[PDB]
């Protein structure tokens, strides 16, 4: 059994907004706060949000079956990688995608020039009925920000490792051309992946070609 | 803190003061104060509130104290420009409470002042 | 040589009585004696000395304020409060024997008990999931003691017996007591010291006698003791816990013993009973009697 | 307990596990169990001429939830209502304990019925509006009371209900009842 | 017969959810101490995760994992050597969270987008806030001296896997990343020497 | 599943004002600023603004149903292109318009002339009964500035790609004949679109004709 560690950077090409919960809002304050690491108050990218977006894009690329009801009806590669919960056909997820935290390098860069980690984007919605704008404030992680992402791959079937990493590269290529987080169709969440390394932390597996 | 005639400053007093000023005519608050001037003052206090919110230390830093001083300056300027803003500021004692917040010099008192301001805005919206 | 042993429990305990879901706040003397026997077996210590020369008391609640003994089974001339009153502070218990305790003070004593809180952990078995199966949920009873509160018991024995008990309890601190030990429960710390108060309750002369431990007499002693008694006959059943006993786990022979706190006008000596059937080693059950003398 | 109870439960998705003696155990739809428990209470009062009251605990569980855990956890809820002096009922969570007259009149009829007609009548109003009010409620800070008024001002709700909802929120006891009123409406309107 | 106490702190690198309701309320509360209300990590979860990772690494049937975590099979009754206490939220972390008025357990809002209607379903989960620390106590029972080193190497492999793995909750989605710091290894009972033995 | 990337430039023909709040200024100084990228401090064109203006113009051109109240009631082409959230008819957004950033060529061109990217336009309002001026200062992006946009089109249905790109062309033509940002009715925000490359980044769709 082997575990392959993929550590890298996610660079915010356009402002990133992933929702946050449990905070009531002051009148005139941000309508939509982002998810933040409560200990550090810095924004983070939830591992689930990347895994869900990556899996959704990869599944759309592979092709969904007609009238697919559940996530467990995906292609065998998608279930092999991200996991399945079919009754009597449970497959362990090979991809454990952890939460991406605001990097200390970007922390230093934003402490220089006295730049806030997040920025409030003021928006409105002009109605099709009365043509009256309805303002909102969306918090978004700044464009300069970088997040340290850490993924683990579980080497269960060696013969499928190369195909699984090909699918991972396809999914990440889709995600770079897609967005992450919410509001992406209106310019939010565009990202770039920079793979610092693909190490093997567990086992004797040779991962230099991945 | 407290007002003249020994009344207590709280969100209950925010509701009470928005109600006593409220005059039927259209609903007129503080002799012609409009929602827009109230939202401008709320924008000022919101900038200061964001400054303090981002911070975690209870003691108010020097920059937010200067922000409160400039808030008092803006209060005076808006009072001079518009009679209704002057009436609102003197009836709700917002600048006096800015002085009180500066005297106390803690995050709790500034957050309570922000809550009082927000309650004034909310009840002004409700009673219109 | 009466020694008070106080157990303060760091993690919750199961202390099962009939199922895995239910949890008891205390254990009877037979459970603690079986744990001591198991520990002596592990520590390669002889069992004969512990079996013969040691008489132990059931585990009973205590707080920082009071140590609670079982309610004696004596006639009461309201009744719901006395039913709810399971444990009485030792100073109150003499008053209860004198019969001065009224219903309101009985309810006050019952509410005074702050031993701890009983909960139920919900867990799963995922073993089938690997072998193309589904996970199965189950439940484990728990009892978490308040920081001041704990359990205690009195043990009488010879000096060597007391030292052996000290060593066995030092080991039991990490071995644990109760159900689902070695799976996150039952861990405790013990402190053994002489207790003047308990010795004063121990030494006493009265018309009536009350058990401090679950016990049952032999037939010859039963003939004399049974008459003129108010007792609760509780069943002691369980699965054998050993590797040596059999290839597969086997239930113990059902036993029936007088519950601790039962009142006998005639005292009986206890007997260590054997509930083994067709096993490699005899399974021991503790039914020795710890007695307190009282006047009603 | 046995003969008359069957007539009381007539027309409701309720199954009597046992009535035994004084202690009852019933399992049924969450909506009908609450309704019949009130109907049981009013019929019991007439039967006993007011000299007798009964305390009950009501729980809400999914179908797949074990039966044994339903009896164990709901018995503790009864134990909460029994703990208070005489007439009490524990609905759903332990915190929500109300008098039988309070649950039937102050919650279901005084507050929930105006809320039900509110959603149907107003196109703008949506479950989203209910949840936003619910978040402002359940907040000890008195500032949320002002925020509720701010939320109610632009909500375009009817004036009588807007005054009613504001008045209920300010009172400490009436807030609990208003919270329960929304929850019941939210549960009743799912899917 | 010896016993080896392992004293350690588990650090929550990402929000920890061990599971264990009212509308609009977190429907997935973590395990908490019934009295102190401090969230805990059941010792059963640690033991089961370690056993599962050892099964995956070695491969349950294997004699080593079965002796370490207990066996009840007919003819193969084995006492569990690893008795792991439920992890307790640490005092130092409790003070560090009392400062700055930080809650002990964060709530995480999550949504599922259906593959058919594209609708989103929202779940609020409770996670022990990142940066917390749980004291962990493990008792290793030296049933046989000859197997102590091998069992400790197995523990070390299990710990390393769990460092690279998660603990409870949905760990493939980021939750449960933990780091084990062991304060000390010591022989509480018996004369066995555990100075050379390191869990990590 | 294909992803076609449209890349080009937005040329500011008339000073562009996109309002962004959250700024306190000195008495008599600039009253209304523009939206800027916090990291660079250079003016930005949000993808929300581009998408909203294009969708509004396209919906007007295709037609508004009588008494329309929401955006999900727009024409099926608009819902297919820009997305939808109607109950039971959630349609994904094929267009993912991104934030347009200040072009580096335009930045160097302005630095050549020693010119500021933003100008403070001085305006006033003459009252109708008192004829007393009320002065305002509005920040605008200087004419002659270029913003390089970035649009992603998701080919979900191969049949409708030609019609979708025809609608995109119509929307961009309308936006060129219209304004962007605020104050455009009084001569602000006139822009020109210069498309540089339409290519299929993801997949094997043929984007030569488009």
From Swiss-Prot, chain B:
Name its GO BP terms in alphabetical order: defense response to virus
> Which Pfam families does the annotation name?
Csm2_III-A (PF03750)
Which InterPro entries does the entry link to? Answer: CRISPR-assoc_prot_Csm2_III-A (IPR010149)
Sorted keywords for this record are:
Antiviral defense, RNA-binding
Q: Name one GO molecular function term.
A: RNA binding
Q: Which CDD domains match?
A: Csm2_III-A (cd09647)
Question: What domain of life is recorded for the organism?
Answer: Bacteria
Cleaved signal peptide residues: none
Summary of subunit composition and partner proteins: Part of the Csm effector complex that includes Cas10, Csm2, Csm3, Csm4 and Csm5.
Its family remark reads:
Belongs to the CRISPR-associated Csm2 family.
Query: Please, what other remarks does the record include?
Result: Encoded in a type III-A CRISPR locus.
* Chain's role: CRISPR (clustered regularly interspaced short palindromic repeat) is an adaptive immune system that provides protection against mobile genetic elements (viruses, transposable elements and conjugative plasmids). CRISPR clusters contain spacers, sequences complementary to antecedent mobile elements, and target invading nucleic acids. CRISPR clusters are transcribed and processed into CRISPR RNA (crRNA). This subunit may be involved in monitoring complementarity of crRNA and target RNA.
Q: What is this protein called?
A: CRISPR system Cms protein Csm2
Gene encoding this polypeptide? csm2
From Swiss-Prot, chain C:
Task: Report which gene this protein is encoded by.
Answer: csm4
Can you name this protein?
Answer: CRISPR system Cms protein Csm4
Locate the coiled-coil region(s) and give their ranges. Answer: none
InterPro entries assigned: Csm4 (IPR005510), Csm4_C (IPR040932), RAMP_III_fam (IPR005537)
Q: How does it assemble?
A: Part of the Csm effector complex that includes Cas10, Csm2, Csm3, Csm4 and Csm5.
Specify one Pfam family: Csm4_C
**What is this protein for, i.e. what is its function?**
CRISPR (clustered regularly interspaced short palindromic repeat) is an adaptive immune system that provides protection against mobile genetic elements (viruses, transposable elements and conjugative plasmids). CRISPR clusters contain spacers, sequences complementary to antecedent mobile elements, and target invading nucleic acids. CRISPR clusters are transcribed and processed into CRISPR RNA (crRNA).
Which keywords does this chain's UniProt record carry? Antiviral defense, RNA-binding
Would you identify the family this protein belongs to, as annotated?
A: Belongs to the CRISPR-associated Csm4 family.
- Listed as disulfide-bonded, the cysteine pairs are none
Instruction: Set out the biological process GO terms recorded for this chain's protein.
Output: defense response to virus
Other noteworthy facts: Encoded in a type III-A CRISPR locus.
UniProtKB/Swiss-Prot annotation, chain D:
Quote one Gene Ontology molecular function term: transferase activity
Would you kindly state one Gene Ontology biological process term found in this protein's UniProt entry?
Answer: defense response to virus
> Keywords assigned by UniProt?
Antiviral defense, ATP-binding, Endonuclease, Exonuclease, Hydrolase, Nuclease, Nucleotide-binding, RNA-binding, Transferase
Transferase is among the record's keywords: yes
- The residues covered by the GGDEF domain are 1-94
What further note is attached to this protein's record?
Encoded in a type III-A CRISPR locus.
Domain comment from the record reads as follows:
The N-terminal HD domain has ssDNase activity. The C-terminal GGDEF domain has the cOA synthesis activity.
Q: What does this protein do?
A: CRISPR (clustered regularly interspaced short palindromic repeat) is an adaptive immune system that provides protection against mobile genetic elements (viruses, transposable elements and conjugative plasmids). CRISPR clusters contain spacers, sequences complementary to antecedent mobile elements, and target invading nucleic acids. CRISPR clusters are transcribed and processed into CRISPR RNA (crRNA). ssDNase activity is stimulated in the ternary Csm effector complex; binding of cognate target RNA activates the ssDNase, as the target RNA is degraded ssDNA activity decreases.
Assembly with partners or alone? Part of the Csm effector complex that includes Cas10, Csm2, Csm3, Csm4 and Csm5.
Q: Which family does it belong to?
A: Belongs to the CRISPR-associated Cas10/Csm1 family.
Protein name (database record):
CRISPR system single-strand-specific deoxyribonuclease Cas10/Csm1 (subtype III-A)
Q: What species is this protein from?
A: Enterococcus italicus (strain DSM 15952 / CCUG 50447 / LMG 22039 / TP 1.5)
Give the stretch of the parent protein shown, with its full length: 563 to 753 of 755
From Swiss-Prot, chain E:
Q: What class of enzyme is it?
A: hydrolase
InterPro entries tied to this protein: CRISPR-assoc_RAMP_Csm3 (IPR013412), CRISPR_Csm3_endoribonuclease (IPR052216), RAMP_III_fam (IPR005537)
Q: Which family does this protein fall into?
A: Belongs to the CRISPR-associated Csm3 family.
Q: Which UniProt keywords apply?
A: Antiviral defense, Endonuclease, Hydrolase, Nuclease, RNA-binding
Misc remark: Encoded in a type III-A CRISPR locus.
The record's function comment reads:
CRISPR (clustered regularly interspaced short palindromic repeat) is an adaptive immune system that provides protection against mobile genetic elements (viruses, transposable elements and conjugative plasmids). CRISPR clusters contain spacers, sequences complementary to antecedent mobile elements, and target invading nucleic acids. CRISPR clusters are transcribed and processed into CRISPR RNA (crRNA). This subunit has the target ssRNA endonuclease activity; it cleaves multiple sites in the target RNA at 6 nucleotide intervals.
This entry's Enzyme Commission designation comes to: 3.1.-.-
**Record GO biological process:** defense response to virus
- Please provide an example of a Pfam family that matches this protein in its UniProt record: RAMPs
On assembly, the entry states: Part of the Csm effector complex that includes Cas10, Csm2, Csm3, Csm4 and Csm5.
Provide the gene name from the record: csm3
Task: List, in alphabetical order, the Gene Ontology terms for molecular function in this entry.
Answer: endonuclease activity; RNA binding
Organism of derivation: Enterococcus italicus (strain DSM 15952 / CCUG 50447 / LMG 22039 / TP 1.5)
Q: Name it.
A: CRISPR system Cms endoribonuclease Csm3
